[PDB]
Design a protein around this ligand. Structure first.
Ligand code: MG
Ligand code: ZN
Ligand code: ZN
Lengths: 50, 471, 1334
RNA sequence: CGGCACAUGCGAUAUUAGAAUGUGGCGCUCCGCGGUUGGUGAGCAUGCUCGGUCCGUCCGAGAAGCCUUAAAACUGCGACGACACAUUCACCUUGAACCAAGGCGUGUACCG
């Protein structure tokens, strides 16, 4: 019941960098530049309610 | 956070540990300090002759070999006789060659053979503090002359010091600077008698110790700088070895005294260890100091950790009982009866009961009885020092009845019977005292007393007073 | 013996003056023999001898000496009570901060040096340095350092520099300060410069400074140099049985302090290094601070125990301190305690009491009489005679009882009827017999509760218990004039069975010559107890002046009524016994008998009622049985119909027609409808079920069911519990507070299955937990209310003022909730009130209104009466009796002296256990509209432009039957003054639509309305009238963000239509969602809408505490034209324009929230600017003291009358008086006080009336309401401010101030153990006050 | 407008691993012995004398001896108790322990 500490520091107390923390808690949207214009890879379920 | 143990740790955490050679270096600084204070003693002849008179008290069978000093540099009484006989020849050949620079090497040799003697700290610190008192009287006279002339008559301290510091003995500062006709020389003429008298008392202090304050000031500032060097070295070693006190005092924490109390008693023991440390035996500081720290801590826990202060050997007996009853409990199995402690130990088993009784800590008077209500133990303790009010009623009625009965007697019988006992007056009076009251015979008072009691034992007077004895 | 108690600081010279020894060694007693150790914490030469008049060695053992001291070992041979009295001291080596002046929240060393507390603790724990008047070279005075900065300052400035650390540094700071120089400095800073909140803190600090210099204190006394120690018999170490001791933990604390002080002296002898002595000074600081108040550090625990020990402030402060455990309430001798029981054979001036308790209590009385009568020669013989219980002592005990009242007491003694006196009748038994009618006063049932008896020893206490506290004196409550000796349960059942009538019985319709042959007919069995019968009775009346005029007649009554008529006294009319006589009727009977015949016939009449009630209840045989609960034949039919209807709603939800919430609401409404049909079935199946015959076919009547008599008589329970026994029981609520859609369709006469009973268990357990918690909170509320108001005593006979509040009836929306009569009955008039024909004096100016005067009020048509109230009295230090009223156990005016604050606070907090569209006019009369400003529209109706309109339904007798808070902009059908009929909806507003109605008639236009930015183009699907409607703040663009849409009017000519009567047009600004329906250039009429804007007990402890409401109603400061200022800050500037005064006031309003007024209107001071709850501070600061006391009494009487509990309003008014005693002065003038100083209103009032009687100018004040936990501590008498609440802050605030307490008001006099200046002791204090300084 | 910190109220009344050694001096120890001043509840229910007698017993006034004075106190001689100092051996080796987490309120300080 001690002082409020930020959460992710305990993840950084378990030998985790920012890369695999964001890998474990998030899914990756891939931006490819197919020759121009900075396109976006799409899974259609990602667009729900948007 | 406050938590003053942690503030102590952070206040001592800045001090770092010592290497195994820095302890020897600090010990050599301690040697330099005691060397310089003993060499400061070595110039002062009055301390020398004082210990010579104390040694004549040794030779007069009023003292002992273990009173004055202890030990020599290669303690025998024949050795004391021959070394102090060489000392005797040295100070009868030394002092009488002032008749200056011829005598100085003699005084230095007398000083060296004085330094060849290993003193008791009683006599040593007595000489030190006597030099301090002498210096304080000299400084009191100096500050007295300053407060007479400098602040009041507006004389500058530079013109004060000018012919004072440098001669300090004669009237070269005093009488010449009046004749030199300074604007401040006139203001001396109201204070010349007191300044001159303080100057002559300064000369008196010089004549007591033989040499001038020009030497004495350098003697005791040399003593002061040497002792300050020694005290800084000992401060540095204590600040280093606080860690040992902590590592020892981790063990005794739950024995009833607080943690910081333990480490402060350990620090007192550590300072005693730094006082009595000797590196030339070759042991580390730790092995020597650990016994002093544990001794001070154990003595303190035995001294001051109990409400009823029980002494040292009594607590040793209690700890023996707990140790042996810890050993026997895993030997027999149930718990030891004190009948087994009769043959287990050397005590007659009736004392073991009272040792077992004394070792109980008293209950807190706010220790809660059950159900955790406002009912604590303090609300149940009855007062047994009051008197019941019925006894006060008996005392009132008894005074009334005895007053009515003594009214029924004669004048002399009632007066004697009131005077003899504590009846409604001050202290009682005995036979010769009542005889000096009435100018009457001692035996006649006894006869009147027996006749009075014989008058009171008969009924119609004995009824109302026999009523105050219950069956 | 003495006068006023003074408190101050303790100099070390004062502490050495107290002490008779220095305690140099930490021992307590020697271990082997338990003589005290010299010179330890328990000493002889320091404190006193151990035994009475005896030295410790034994050289002086007797009364031969009392002045001597033994030269072997120091003992001043005296009484050993001296050891309870003499104190010691400890010479602390290094100084030490006092924890009370360091760690309490208004820290005194903190804001005395103007230094933050963390830096002060940083100095005291040797973590830093602080300069102590170190000259002016580089470093300021309060400028702290660190160690490296100290080395910096020392190498940069070797000399003329002074900075210590620790307690020495704080002591040098406090010693160095010259106070009056800084007094001049802060007076200059409060004259020229103005830094508002900081200068408020600054004037608080200058108040502390010129209060400190006015005292006799020095600041460096806040650091302890010599610490006093307490006498040994207050921290005793006494033998228990068994050779083991009990020490108090103060012995541990003083042992630790003495130990560390000796250690620090030993370290400074040996010239320790600095780390060690700084450790030891911190440890000595911790030891002293743990001794003075343990718990403001790391809570230093004791030895061989995990439990934290008990320090000095633990022994003063709290539930177990001396203020609340051993001074305000003491355990008392001459008391007893046993189980109570009934014994109905008593008159109510007497109670039973056991012979064994009467022998044990009255032992010294028996001793006295036996040694007087000579049966015991001495007193020890008297002890053995009463020990053996010989037969001669019982006549002696019957002599000593005969006229000696005892006090009976039940443990929750909430109101003042909990302690009453009685005369004992001795009982063969071990249980106190307690008179039955008295028990409703005690809230004592006989289910095992046990009571306590106390004995008045002295003669004055016997006369007090007979004259004031005998049970026959208290037959009226102090909460109201209702009888508290109301007959409770068996007696009202015996009456309700006795006075009733069945249509056929024995002796039906015969004739009787009087009540005597009624009794001869009933007790012979010829005629029944109840049969309608013509009798001849003779009633007396008080027609002439106190004269008993007799009239005799044949009344048509019953037999049992005639039998009860013998018990009625002479004065009452016969109509008091001609009805059915339930509980309400018998309470009215006792009330009329007391208000006519005085006290004695009412007491003997209550005893005769109780006797005849118990006797004819025994003759009743009123017995409950299983056939007595008739189940309706229509029960299961209604339950089957409801079970089909829930299947209908179930099919309508499975068809997707409805949502869940409307389904839920429909199902709960139809189950409540089924429960109501079951209730109206079972009531008509109980109450009229008895149908019998006389000289004809049939006839129905009220039933002789047992449970119907026990519910109709009001004996026990009402129709809710009868409903739960016969019909279905309710609709239970789950732990959510949600309520189950499937109710319990079974009563207790039928079985309950497992699930229904399991659901009911939750309601039962919630009820029990709530009763426990509400008991605790009601106790706390009573305690705060009495401790804010013990100081108030009726002291003067009359002040003679013209002040007063305006008693009106409290009708609101529905019918009468409390009429004019029972509000004003008991009070006194301020000015004379007049008939509706004016200049007709019906009462003169100040007469005590009693029941004939309220009869004279009701025979006329009066509606509002001005009444003297205690909150507006004129008296210094109390309330004059002629202003208070009359209500008490007696009926006359309040006597000079009697404490009314205590009885008021008890009568408020005692029922704390018991606590939890359009106009549809009901009644008929004429219409009245107050503060109305309206205009006729085109449709013949009337639209209202003023929202202060109050609707009053005034009948032909002038009084008000209904009132309606008229909303702004309603549609009146009738006008004003026209005779209206019942049911007629006169005003029909749209409650979902805020009106933007006008007074003008012309072409509506757009002004500052830009399309797409301030207004959007909507094209309607339903109506089809496309328009430009104002949008929200998110979508309006940066141009039209601050620019607001406005509506304005022209006529046909294009000229701006002015309001008929003024010159301002109607330019109105619309918020978001304000729908523009009528566009540019569209004609309207007078008042058409230019647009439309669509969409318990802790209450009492919030009111008297006067906490700030969550959403406050905002109120205008001064009356004037309202206007707007700047836009879009989150707030807006509300600007007021008074016509005569200086205008420039503006107030920040959070502009998201809906306002009330429009910009075109004008408000009065104290008028509402929005809605919601309002703080009492605003009502007091704007309207007046009469308005805020009316607000409190109306709100808390709503809270009490919701439960249906009567409390007279005097009590709430006098608590309101005790709230607002403090008042801050605005203009100082010729007075001594300050522009922001808070002083009590009575003290500034006696100052002004000395100055205003002279030619000088007075001091104008600002009255300031404080809550009950803050107006009770802000008091000029600190023991009443230290007895209950936060103790440490009060003692330190009164110790730095040198405050003097003049014992002033019953708390201190209970504390100090002398007479009370309210009751019988008022004459004593009046004689002393006449004697004192005259 | 957030954060950190602290204070404060209520949470019913009532009833239930030390071991060993020596020396020194001290006594606010009530422990044996001696010396010193110095008493008290015994003969005496009249041991003696005289007077009154209600009497041979009780009242009123006198003188003496024997015998109870180490009691009370004082001071020394033993015991004990507590205290100080000193010594010998063995072990020990540089930053601890700790509880408790479930309610409802009021308020203050600091920082952003
Ligand atoms: Mg009960
Ligand atoms: Zn003594
Ligand atoms: Zn008044």
């Amino acid at each position: 019941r001690r002082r409020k500490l930020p959460a992710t520091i305990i993840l950084r107390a378990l030998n985790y960098t920012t890369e695999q923390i964001l890998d474990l808690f998030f899914e990756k949207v891939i931006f490819e530049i197919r020759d121009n214009k900075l396109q976006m890879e799409l899974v259609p379920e990602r667009l729900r309610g948007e | 956070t406050t938590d003053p143990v942690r503030m102590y740790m952070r206040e001592m955490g800045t001090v770092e540990l010592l290497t195994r050679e820095g302890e020897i270096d600090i010990a050599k600084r301690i040697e330099d300090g005691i060397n310089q204070v003993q060499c400061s003693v070595a110039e002062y002849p009055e301390a020398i002759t004082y210990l010579l008179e104390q040694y004549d008290r040794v030779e007069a069978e009023e003292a002992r070999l273990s009173d004055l000093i202890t030990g020599f540099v290669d303690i025998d009484p024949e050795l004391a006789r021959e070394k102090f006989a060489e000392l005797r020849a040295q100070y009868v050949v030394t002092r009488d060659t002032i008749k200056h620079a011829t005598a100085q090497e003699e005084i230095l040799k007398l000083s060296e053979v004085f330094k060849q003697f290993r003193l008791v700290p009683k006599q040593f610190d007595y000489l030190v503090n006597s030099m301090r008192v002498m210096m304080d009287r000299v400084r009191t006279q100096e500050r007295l002359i300053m407060k007479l002339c400098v602040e009041q008559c507006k004389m500058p301290k530079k013109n004060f010091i000018t012919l004072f510091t440098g001669n300090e003995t004669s009237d070269t500062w005093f009488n010449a600077a009046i004749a030199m006709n300074k604007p401040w020389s006139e203001k001396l003429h109201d204070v010349s008698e007191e300044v001159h008298r303080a100057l002559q008392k300064l000369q008196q202090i010089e004549e007591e110790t033989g040499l001038t304050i020009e030497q004495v000031k350098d003697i005791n500032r040399r003593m002061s700088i040497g002792e300050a060097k020694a005290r800084r070295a000992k401060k540095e070693m204590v600040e280093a070895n606080l860690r040992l006190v902590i590592s020892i005092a981790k063990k005794y924490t739950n024995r009833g005294l607080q943690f910081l109390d333990l480490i402060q008693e350990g620090n007192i023991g550590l300072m005693k260890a730094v006082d009595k440390f000797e590196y030339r035996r070759g042991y580390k500081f730790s092995t020597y100091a650990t016994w002093w720290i544990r001794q001070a801590i154990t003595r303190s826990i035995a001294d001051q950790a109990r409400t009823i202060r029980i002494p040292v050997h009594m607590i040793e007996t209690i700890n023996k009982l707990n140790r042996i009853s810890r050993q026997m409990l895993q030997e027999m199995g149930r718990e030891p009866t004190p009948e087994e402690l009769a043959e287990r130990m050397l005590m007659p088993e009736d004392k073991i009961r009272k040792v077992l009784k004394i070792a109980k800590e008293p209950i807190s008077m706010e220790t809660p009885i059950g159900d955790d209500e406002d009912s604590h133990l303090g609300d149940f303790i009855e007062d047994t020092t009051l008197e019941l009010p019925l006894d006060s009623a008996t005392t009132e009625s008894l005074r009334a009845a005895t007053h009515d009965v003594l009214a029924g007697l004669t004048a002399r019988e009632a007066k004697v019977l009131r005077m003899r006992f504590g009846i409604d007056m001050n202290t009682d009076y005995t036979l010769e005292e009542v005889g000096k009251q009435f100018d009457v015979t001692r035996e006649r008072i006894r006869q009147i007393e027996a006749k009075a009691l014989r008058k009171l034992r008969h009924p119609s007077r004995s009824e109302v007073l026999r009523s105050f004895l219950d069956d | 013996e003495f006068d006023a108690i003074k408190i101050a600081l303790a100099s070390p010279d004062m502490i050495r003056s107290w002490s008779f020894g220095e305690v140099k060694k930490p021992e307590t007693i020697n271990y082997r023999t338990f003589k005290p150790e010299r010179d330890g914490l328990f000493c002889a030469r320091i404190f006193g001898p151990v035994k009475d008049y005896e030295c410790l060695c034994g050289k002086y053992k007797r009364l031969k000496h009392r002045g001597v001291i033994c030269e072997k070992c120091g003992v001043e041979v005296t009484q050993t009570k001296v050891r309870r009295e003499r104190m010691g001291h400890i010479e602390l080596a290094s100084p030490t901060a006092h924890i009370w002046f360091l760690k309490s929240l208004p820290s005194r060393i903190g804001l005395l040096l103007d230094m933050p507390l963390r830096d002060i603790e940083r100095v005291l724990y040797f973590e830093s340095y602080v300069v102590i008047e170190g000259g002016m070279t580089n470093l300021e005075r309060q400028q702290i350092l660190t160690e490296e900065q100290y080395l910096d300052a020392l190498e940069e400035f070797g000399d003329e520099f002074d900075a210590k650390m620790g307690a020495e540094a704080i002591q040098a700071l406090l010693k160095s300060m010259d106070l009056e120089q800084e007094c001049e400095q802060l007076r200059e800073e409060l004259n020229e410069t103005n830094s508002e909140t900081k200068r408020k803190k600054l004037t608080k600090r200058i108040k502390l400074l010129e209060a400190f210099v006015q005292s006799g204190n020095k600041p460096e006394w806040m650091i302890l140099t010599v610490l006093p120690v307490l006498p040994p018999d207050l921290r005793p170490l006494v033998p228990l049985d068994g050779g083991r001791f009990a020490t108090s933990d103060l012995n541990d604390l003083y042992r630790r302090v003495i130990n560390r002080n000796n250690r620090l002296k030993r370290l400074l002898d040996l010239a320790a290094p600095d780390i060690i002595v700084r450790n030891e000074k911190r440890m000595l600081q911790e030891a002293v601070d743990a001794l003075l108040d343990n718990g403001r550090r790391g809570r230093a625990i004791t030895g061989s125990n995990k439990r934290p020990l008990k320090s000095l402030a633990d022994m003063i402060k709290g539930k177990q301190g001396r203020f609340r455990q051993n001074l305000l309430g003491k355990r008392v001798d001459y008391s007893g305690r046993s189980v109570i029981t009934v014994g109905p054979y008593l008159r109510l001036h007497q109670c039973g009491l056991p012979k064994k308790m009467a022998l044990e209590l009255f032992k010294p009385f028996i001793y006295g009489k036996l040694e007087l009568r000579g049966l015991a020669t001495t007193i020890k013989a008297a002890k053995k005679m009463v020990e053996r219980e010989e037969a001669v002592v019982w006549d002696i005990l019957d002599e000593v009882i005969r006229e000696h009242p005892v006090l009976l007491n039940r443990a929750p003694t909430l109101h003042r009827l909990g302690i009453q006196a009685f005369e004992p009748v001795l009982i063969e038994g071990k249980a106190i017999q307690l008179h039955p009618l008295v028990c409703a006063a005690y809230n004592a049932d006989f289910d095992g509760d046990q009571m306590a008896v106390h004995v008045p020893l002295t003669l004055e206490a016997q006369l007090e218990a007979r004259a004031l506290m005998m049970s026959t004196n208290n037959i009226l409550s102090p909460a109201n004039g209702e009888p508290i000796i109301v007959p409770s349960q068996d007696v009202v059942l015996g009456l309700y069975y006795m006075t009733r009538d069945c249509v056929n019985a024995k002796g039906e319709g015969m004739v009787l010559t009087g009540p005597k042959e009624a009794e001869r007919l009933y007790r012979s069995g010829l005629a029944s107890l109840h049969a309608r019968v013509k009798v001849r009775i003779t009633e007396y009346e008080k027609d002439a002046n106190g004269e008993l005029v007799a009239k005799t007649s044949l009344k048509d009554t019953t037999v049992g009524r005639a039998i009860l008529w013998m018990i009625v006294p002479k004065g009452l009319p016969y109509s008091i016994v001609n009805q059915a006589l339930g509980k309400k009727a018998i309470s009215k009977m006792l009330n009329t008998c007391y208000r006519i015949l005085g006290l004695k016939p009412t007491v003997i009449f209550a005893d005769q009622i109780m006797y005849t009630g118990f006797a004819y209840a025994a003759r009743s045989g009123a017995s409950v049985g299983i056939d007595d609960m008739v189940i309706p034949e229509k029960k299961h039919e209604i339950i089957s119909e409801a079970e089909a209807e829930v299947a209908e709603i179930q099919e309508q939800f499975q068809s997707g027609l409805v949502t869940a919430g409307e389904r839920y609401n429909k199902v709960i409404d139809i189950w409540a409808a089924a429960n109501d049909r079951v209730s109206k079935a079972m009531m008509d199946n109980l109450q009229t079920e008895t149908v019998i015959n006389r000289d004809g076919q049939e006839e129905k009547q009220v039933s002789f069911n047992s449970i119907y008599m026990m519910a109709d008589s009001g004996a026990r329970g009402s129709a809710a519990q009868i409903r739960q026994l016969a019909g279905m029981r309710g609709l239970m609520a789950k732990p959510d507070g949600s309520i189950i859609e499937t109710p319990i369709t079974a009563n207790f006469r039928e079985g309950l299955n497992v699930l229904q009973y399991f659901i009911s268990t939750h309601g039962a357990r919630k009820g029990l937990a709530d009763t426990a918690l509400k008991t605790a909170n009601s106790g706390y509320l009573t305690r705060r209310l009495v401790d804010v108001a013990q100081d108030l005593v009726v002291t003067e006979d009359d002040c003679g003022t013209h002040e007063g509040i305006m008693m009106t009836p409290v009708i609101e929306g529905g019918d009468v909730k409390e009429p004019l009569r029972d509000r004003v009955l008991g009070r006194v008039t301020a000015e004379d009130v007049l008939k509706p024909g004016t200049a007709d004096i019906l009462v003169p100016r100040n007469t005590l209104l009693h029941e004939q005067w309220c009869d004279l009020l009701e025979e006329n048509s009066v509606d509002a009466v001005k009444v003297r109230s205690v909150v507006s009295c004129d008296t210094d230090f109390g309330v004059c009796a002629h202003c208070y009223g009359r209500d008490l156990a007696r009926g006359h005016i309040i006597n000079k002296g009697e404490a009314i604050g205590v009885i008021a606070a008890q009568s408020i907090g005692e029922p704390g256990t018991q606590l939890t569209s359009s106009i549809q006019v009901k009644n008929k009369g004429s219409i009245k509209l107050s503060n109305v400003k309206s205009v006729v529209n085109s449709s013949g109706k009337l639209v209202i432009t003023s929202r202060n309109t109050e609707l009053k339904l005034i009948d032909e007798f002038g009084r008000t039957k209904e009132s309606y808070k008229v909303p702004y902009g309603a549609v009146l059908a009738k006008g004003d003054g026209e005779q209206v009929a019942g049911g007629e909806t006169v005003a029909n507003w749209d409650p979902h639509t805020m009106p933007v109605i006008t007074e003008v008639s012309g072409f509506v236009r757009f002004t500052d309305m830009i399309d797409g930015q301030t207004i959007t183009r909507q094209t309607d699907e339903l109506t089809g009238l496309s328009s430009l409607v104002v949008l929200d703040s998110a979508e309006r663009t940066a141009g039209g963000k601050d620019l607001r849409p406005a509506l304005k009017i022209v006529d046909a000519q294009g000229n701006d239509v002015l309001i008929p009567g003024t010159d301002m047009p109607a330019q109105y600004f619309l918020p978001g969602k304000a729908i523009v329906q009528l566009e540019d250039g569209v004609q309207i009429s007078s008042g058409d809408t230019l647009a439309r804007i669509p969409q318990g007990l802790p209450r009492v402890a919030d009111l008297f505490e006067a906490r700030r409401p969550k959403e406050p109603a905002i109120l205008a400061e001064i009356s004037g034209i309202v206007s707007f200022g700047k836009e879009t800050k989150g707030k807006r500037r509300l600007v007021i324009t008074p016509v005569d005064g200086s205008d420039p006031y503006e107030e920040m309003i959070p502009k998201w929230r809906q306002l009330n007024v429009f910009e075109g209107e004008r408000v009065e001071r104290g008028d509402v600017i929005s809605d919601g709850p309002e703080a009492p501070h605003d009502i007091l600061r704007l309207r007046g003291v009469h308005a805020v006391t009316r607000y409190i009494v109306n709100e808390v009487q709503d809270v009490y009358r919701l439960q249906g509990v009567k409390i007279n309003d005097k009590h709430i008014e006098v608590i309101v008086r005790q709230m607002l005693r403090k008042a801050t002065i605005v203009n100082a003038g010729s007075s001594d006080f300050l522009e922001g100083e808070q002083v009590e209103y009575s003290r500034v009032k006696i100052a002004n009336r000395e100055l205003e009687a002279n030619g000088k100018v007075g001091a104008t004040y600002s009255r300031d309401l404080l809550g009950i936990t803050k107006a009770s501590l802000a008091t000029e008498s600190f023991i009443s401010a230290a007895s209950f609440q936060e103790t440490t802050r009060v003692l330190t605030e009164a110790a730095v101030a040198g405050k003097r307490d003049e014992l002033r008001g019953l708390k201190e006099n209970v504390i100090v153990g002398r007479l009370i200046p309210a009751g019988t002791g008022y004459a004593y204090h009046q004689d002393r006050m006449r004697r004192r300084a005259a």
